[PDB]
Amino acid sequence: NWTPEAIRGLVDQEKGLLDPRIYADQSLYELELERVFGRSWLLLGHESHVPETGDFLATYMGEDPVVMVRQKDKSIKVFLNQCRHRGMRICRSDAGNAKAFTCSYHGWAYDIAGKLVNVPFEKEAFFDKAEWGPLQARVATYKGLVFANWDVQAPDLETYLGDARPYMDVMLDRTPAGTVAIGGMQKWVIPCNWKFAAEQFCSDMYHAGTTTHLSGILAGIPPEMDLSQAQIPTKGNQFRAAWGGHGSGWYVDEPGSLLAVMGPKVTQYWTEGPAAELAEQRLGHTGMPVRRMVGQHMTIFPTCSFLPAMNQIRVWHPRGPNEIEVWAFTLVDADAPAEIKEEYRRHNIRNFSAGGVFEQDDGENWVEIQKGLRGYKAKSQPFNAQMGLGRSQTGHPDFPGNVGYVYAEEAARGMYHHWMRMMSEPSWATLKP
Amino acid sequence: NWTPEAIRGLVDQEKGLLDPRIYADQSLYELELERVFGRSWLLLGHESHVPETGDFLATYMGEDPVVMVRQKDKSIKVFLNQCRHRGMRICRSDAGNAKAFTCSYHGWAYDIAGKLVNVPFEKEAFFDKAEWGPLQARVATYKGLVFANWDVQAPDLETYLGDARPYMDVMLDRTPAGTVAIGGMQKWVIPCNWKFAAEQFCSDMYHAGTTTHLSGILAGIPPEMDLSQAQIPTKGNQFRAAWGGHGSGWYVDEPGSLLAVMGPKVTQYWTEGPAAELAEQRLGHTGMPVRRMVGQHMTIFPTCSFLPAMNQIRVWHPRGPNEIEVWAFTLVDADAPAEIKEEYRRHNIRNFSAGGVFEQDDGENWVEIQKGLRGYKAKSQPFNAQMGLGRSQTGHPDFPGNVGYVYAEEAARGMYHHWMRMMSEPSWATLKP
Amino acid sequence: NWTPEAIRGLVDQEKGLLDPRIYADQSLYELELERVFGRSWLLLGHESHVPETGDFLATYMGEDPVVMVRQKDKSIKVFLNQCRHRGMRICRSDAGNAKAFTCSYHGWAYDIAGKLVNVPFEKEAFFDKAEWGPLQARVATYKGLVFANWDVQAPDLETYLGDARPYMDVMLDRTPAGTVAIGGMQKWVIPCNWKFAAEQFCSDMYHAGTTTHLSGILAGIPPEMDLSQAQIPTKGNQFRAAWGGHGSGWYVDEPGSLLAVMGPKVTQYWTEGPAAELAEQRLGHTGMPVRRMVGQHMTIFPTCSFLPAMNQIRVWHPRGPNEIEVWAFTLVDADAPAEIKEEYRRHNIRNFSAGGVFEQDDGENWVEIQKGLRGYKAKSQPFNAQMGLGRSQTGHPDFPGNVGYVYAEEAARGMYHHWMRMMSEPSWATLKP
Amino acid sequence: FKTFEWPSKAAGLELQNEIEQFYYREAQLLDHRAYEAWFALLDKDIHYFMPLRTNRMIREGELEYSGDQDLAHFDETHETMYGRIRKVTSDVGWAENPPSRTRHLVSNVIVKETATPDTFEVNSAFILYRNRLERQVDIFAGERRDVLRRADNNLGFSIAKRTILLDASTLLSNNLSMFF
Amino acid sequence: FKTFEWPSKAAGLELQNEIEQFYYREAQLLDHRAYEAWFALLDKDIHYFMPLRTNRMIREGELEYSGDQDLAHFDETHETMYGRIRKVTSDVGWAENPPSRTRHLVSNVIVKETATPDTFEVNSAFILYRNRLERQVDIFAGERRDVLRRADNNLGFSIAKRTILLDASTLLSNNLSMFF
Amino acid sequence: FKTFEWPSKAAGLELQNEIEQFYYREAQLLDHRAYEAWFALLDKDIHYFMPLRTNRMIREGELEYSGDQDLAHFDETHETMYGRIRKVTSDVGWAENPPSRTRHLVSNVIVKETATPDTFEVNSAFILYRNRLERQVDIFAGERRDVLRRADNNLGFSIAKRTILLDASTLLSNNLSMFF
Numbered sequence A, B, C: 001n002w003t004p005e006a007i008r009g010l011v012d013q014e015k016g017l018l019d020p021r022i023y024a025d026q027s028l029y030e031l032e033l034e035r036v037f038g039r040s041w042l043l044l045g046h047e048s049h050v051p052e053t054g055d056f057l058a059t060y061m062g063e064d065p066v067v068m069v070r071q072k073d074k075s076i077k078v079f080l081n082q083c084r085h086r087g088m089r090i091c092r093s094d095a096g097n098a099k100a101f102t103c104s105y106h107g108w109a110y111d112i113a114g115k116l117v118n119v120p121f122e123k124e125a126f127f128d129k130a131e132w133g134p135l136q137a138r139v140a141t142y143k144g145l146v147f148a149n150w151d152v153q154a155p156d157l158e159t160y161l162g163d164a165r166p167y168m169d170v171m172l173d174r175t176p177a178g179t180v181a182i183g184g185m186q187k188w189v190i191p192c193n194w195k196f197a198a199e200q201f202c203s204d205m206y207h208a209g210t211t212t213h214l215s216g217i218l219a220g221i222p223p224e225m226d227l228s229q230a231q232i233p234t235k236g237n238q239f240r241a242a243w244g245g246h247g248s249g250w251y252v253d254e255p256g257s258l259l260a261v262m263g264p265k266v267t268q269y270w271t272e273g274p275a276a277e278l279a280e281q282r283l284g285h286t287g288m289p290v291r292r293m294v295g296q297h298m299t300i301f302p303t304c305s306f307l308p309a310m311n312q313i314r315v316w317h318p319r320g321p322n323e324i325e326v327w328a329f330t331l332v333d334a335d336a337p338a339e340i341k342e343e344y345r346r347h348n349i350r351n352f353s354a355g356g357v358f359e360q361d362d363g364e365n366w367v368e369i370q371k372g373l374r375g376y377k378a379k380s381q382p383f384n385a386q387m388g389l390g391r392s393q394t395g396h397p398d399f400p401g402n403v404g405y406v407y408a409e410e411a412a413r414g415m416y417h418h419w420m421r422m423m424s425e426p427s428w429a430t431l432k433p
Numbered sequence D, E, F: 001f002k003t004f005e006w007p008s009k010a011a012g013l014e015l016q017n018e019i020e021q022f023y024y025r026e027a028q029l030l031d032h033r034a035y036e037a038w039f040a041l042l043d044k045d046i047h048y049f050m051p052l053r054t055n056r057m058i059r060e061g062e063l064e065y066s067g068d069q070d071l072a073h074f075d076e077t078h079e080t081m082y083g084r085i086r087k088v089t090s091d092v093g094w095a096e097n098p099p100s101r102t103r104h105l106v107s108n109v110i111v112k113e114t115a116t117p118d119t120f121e122v123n124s125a126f127i128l129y130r131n132r133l134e135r136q137v138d139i140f141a142g143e144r145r146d147v148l149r150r151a152d153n154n155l156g157f158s159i160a161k162r163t164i165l166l167d168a169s170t171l172l173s174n175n176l177s178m179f180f
């Protein structure tokens, strides 16, 4: 029994207080499934995961198991992986290509679209099949990326994404052919609330540029080169969305941390090259110098995060207030050279896999935070999110949006604000931009 | 909290809809322990499990552990397996013979009657010994089968079983010598709601005739046969109890399964011969052609489920909304030859034990259903229990009671309604049999 | 959402009845972290765990991780092991010596005082360093034992202990040097409520006098003699704290059990000789036959439990209503012979470690009780706490306070009465000692 | 089933290696779903047996295991085993389609010669690790008691008898879709 | 405790086998509750040790294990071990009545000869699977650093000294009623 | 990845013992955190490979593992591995400071020769028990497929190529900061 008055008293973007009960309390999460994950746009993957007709990918929308499957008409339809007779999972494999779908319990047959087509012994034992198939979701695509939403009256992806759109095209729209996904989907389980993961890739450069990834950068630099040249970055800019809570952070000018993460060959394709300068003309009108963007993180609300400079994509599946699954793949430009695509594959394994020199440290951080939140006095006093307060201009002469300093938490205060709105406001009549 | 109005809305046998929260909700399960398990008749075993004096068997009633122990005057007393001093388990082993029961924590001694008879250092402490013995359950035996109820205000076993008794007699009283339990009690754990199990042995022959057990029949049929033959049972009937949610389904004149599942020796014994003539003679007042019923299932609400023809019996012990313990054992007619009893032993191990060729698939299905019900949008829409809706008539001139077609969710609706009644009506006159 | 009236119904000390739901209820547990652990005097260890400047020990207050650390001024400060920025564990290792505490996530530097000393880019973003450090607890010592509280409105440690002090001094105050702790903290997990553990060391001599430790006594007695010839003591007393719900039990003159637990050489030290005599000179103000005190158990409410004569000390950290962590160490006189110190080490390991011959039977019982409490009817009837009811007096010539028979539930009633008083009464003004 | 009555003089080094290597190979077949190749190792007179195990006081300890008249987790001769193989390779065998990911780690191999030539009583311990679908994990431990014969085949031996003693009373797994 | 300093030249095949076979047998006695017979394997100068293991920074990595002046899970001599055997076989010993279902999977056996003949330093890894009552499962793993004397008996060796380094800090089991 | 193709004639006793003992010593170095010493065993042309593993229908049974052109848990070479070594031995490597308590139980060692002298195709099964911090326990089981060369070092061999086939689709642990 959480009322709007009480929910509003958990997040204060004006001061910078965060009530810890949001990561722990069972009831707030059970409301999150309804109020957030039941009506937000969620990343299901990339178009190239389902290139041909019949191709499918068993993924998740919050805790709802969902089937993303390409159609005859080159469109993508998404539905609940639940047979509506007695709840049985219809598509039972991670990914593949089927002509149809059949329940293994009583044998209800479905076509590729999720339409119910045959129920065994129908004229003998029976009702209308037309309104008894799995619940379809809204399906939208933003140049490769496939998103889905349950709510019929929620804004279309384009609107929901808002003023952040150009920032997404940094990783996505770089060529006429677009990007493609490398095969394989990395899946592992971290015992912590999803909000830590979303917030990190939103505004948390402050962890990478201090202590969390001191060993991560130690792995990248040459055996001779210790933490002396690795030059520790200092400059960078942080974006906050006008509406949505979407955020992004990137280092500016200083190419220190990127050379360690992705190596020499990748950085040439990103900073100084035929394709690197192509983006500065394809996205020149977006008011952004892409050649200066070196090392970047970005979170799309609620559970979408991606590092444009390293091309890592991940979806944080919530698994109770105390746990999350982590699904991740990587993207590459469809027409890029093979040896740039190979260095993208190897390094994204090296740094950002389950056993990656970077992700190892993030998990162990989040493991301890969640564990501490079992105690009473650990949920008594508010967390500090006052970093960079009153230091974001809405008209920065280098990047569009609410921009300030890189080690700030305005993008973080934005994420918790939209969250607070989506939890306290029941109707889209008030919530829409 | 769940009001009577809210509980009544969960199951609607009118439209044939089930609100998926019933299988998953934590608050309902706790009321289930009170409203359903804390006042229903519950199977605990067979008389031959505890044949001689002092023979005991530690089993469960819901999540309350209990002791079923034979008395000197040849009665079977059932009491709470809990000491009333500080809640320690009195009987700490699975089965055997006891001269007396003694508590391990503070040495409080008990007679086989359950009564507290010895408290050490009593005079330097005190209260009456007669008052402070563990809670006593009502005991009722239907030819070997031992049931138990906690409620003094609950109906007697006969009125509880009602017009369902004849279908229990098919398995039990075939001979004047009665039946005997084959030694061994099989126990394994399935992560799913007990209602899935309770419904399937009540109503669901549909799963056997369709997709679930295609590979199970394949394991039984001759190596000179494939699933196209296997002689596939088509028609049949389904029983719904007048009261108590006791359902049963059986095939008639289609031996295919009864051969494949149980072998030729069992099939000939069950349908033909002087041994089976006695069965049709003793049970010849019900009007049923029991020598023609080829494979039968039955559930006695709530958790007593058995398969007459195969003689497979099981009690589902509940372990939260997300988990059950399955305890399975088998009966034989005490006056049966050496061979038939061996076939009954062998074929139930092959088919319906934890690694049985049938049992494996049921578990695989149920595991996946409960996993999907963790989702939010997976509990928002009702399931479809409409099969055989408005088809069952009481004027069937072969089997007494409400009888429809073999593939019907008629008994299902009877089981779910009775559950909803028990959950909403606190008194037993309002819950009139 | 419990009312004080309902909470008072859980414990009735007059009739001597306990509603079992106190050990099982989730709702009650959560209030306990607030109403009990968030204002009770909680043991964190000993001075000798942190002898030098900078030395630290990571331990627990309820489910709150804490850091017991020795200061430059020979004082000890205790702060929440949660970082105030975003909740990371500040001190990651069990024990050691620190010059400064860096936080691993964003690098929030702390000194050994718990104060926030340095913040990376503090001058950039900006809030002041003073009040933004880990939550400090009040730190008070009782002749070696370090206790810790959260709230300033709680009584001082000395008054909080009250008339229980004389019985702590039997173990503690024996020489003008203080008792030192033997290196190593034993730690293990027992799936049960803390109240069973706290109560057992408070009042329950009964279990050790009866069935629980029959085999444990069998291990320490000479290989020739068995239980029959051995010696089963009966003579002893029981103390109940005026305020606090503390309790203690002891045997009078009988070495049998103490000779079985601690061996010959230790019994000597506690009953006869210069060191034993000096104890009967220092405890002169109490007026107790402290050398006739052979074998003793004591609980300092809520979770501090020790056995004086065998010098075994343990803390019960709660982990939900269905689990505790047991953190145990051992104490000895600093100026005692090395032979006695080894003996005290040897026999404490043998009896009270995770694999100790006493501790084994303790765990076996508690696991079962909590298991039983999963059931509905297992919580329907109250537990018996009527032992010794109305035999205690305040005029005992040997031992001061509320003294009764050794096998009584007077201290237990006192413990559960005090628990009920703290849960209900929110204000210390009525709660005052 | 008391302590395995091992021979005084230990089995030869060559024989030890042979039987150890047999088990390693047999584990590879099962871990890579070569059920057809694995079934061929079973003789006509095979008795595949996994008894029930109960909780008893030491008073009545001999009642721990289920007898010949009693029930079991497995009591298989050749044809019924054959029935199970057709099921596990079958497309409509849901319990193992998609298949599990198992690991049969074998050690503690003790070899005993017998009266019959080319025949041995073999004791061995194991831990079976089963990972299924998304997150399911079932860990089994126990011992195997086999009667093995020398064989024309690629593994060196054929199985005549196998008794699986499982260190569990109540099965914690939802099924026994695997072979021990 | 550093990395076990193994001999450059590995042990002989006969000896390596015998020591392995010794443990495999030892496990059999323990896993079939033949405690008194298992006890008969321990010499009068037995040192049965299992230190506490703490979490430490790399800087303080040498204070990971508890010393001889500190507490332990097990720190036993002959008479103390006999007491435990007297308890474990007793009916009034409730922690093991009903008894648990245990499995000692032994592997990684590394042999080292000493100054004394017939006496050996043995390194070995183990996984102990303990199942208790209805649903209790504890899984332990660690190494055993033994000292084995040759003995003229059914098992071939006798235990002189034993140190169990257990891969745990906080024990997840409620007790240690079993033997290692 | 199919069933390991084992040779009809099993490897010699001497050889089978050498490689087993090598893996035992290997497990010793890793379980006692002697990383710099373990890294020296890896040759220049090393390929440390741990592919992803997905749930597939039998029909798509061949599509289970991620190829050499897809993402994986590990796909490392000599350079990248030294990075991980410099991370694990670092004081600021929080994911392993406090360090873990791992245990490599190694068995099922099958040995196979090739065309190149002193080079062997080794198959082996393992269970890895990782215990972390206070309460964290992660159990791994998979198989290792190695290409080992004879080298002039303390262990007798060096690693040229390694493939780990973990029996896991979704990793239940939060990380893989350990080595297999």
Ligand code: FES
Pocket (backbone or CB within 6 Å): A083, A084, A085, A086, A087, A088, A103, A104, A105, A106, A107, A108
């Ligand atoms: S649940 Fe899908 S058909 Fe019965």
Ligand code: FES
Pocket (backbone or CB within 6 Å): B083, B084, B085, B086, B087, B088, B103, B104, B105, B106, B107, B108
């Ligand atoms: S609990 Fe049975 S006597 Fe104390």
Ligand code: FES
Pocket (backbone or CB within 6 Å): C083, C084, C085, C086, C087, C088, C103, C104, C105, C106, C107, C108
């Ligand atoms: S939480 Fe300590 S600085 Fe981020």
Ligand SMILES: [Fe+2]
Pocket (backbone or CB within 6 Å): A207, A208, A212, A213, A358, A362
């Ligand atoms: Fe990071």
Ligand SMILES: [Fe+2]
Pocket (backbone or CB within 6 Å): B207, B208, B212, B213, B358, B362
């Ligand atoms: Fe079925």
Ligand SMILES: [Fe+2]
Pocket (backbone or CB within 6 Å): C207, C208, C212, C213, C358, C362
């Ligand atoms: Fe005790």
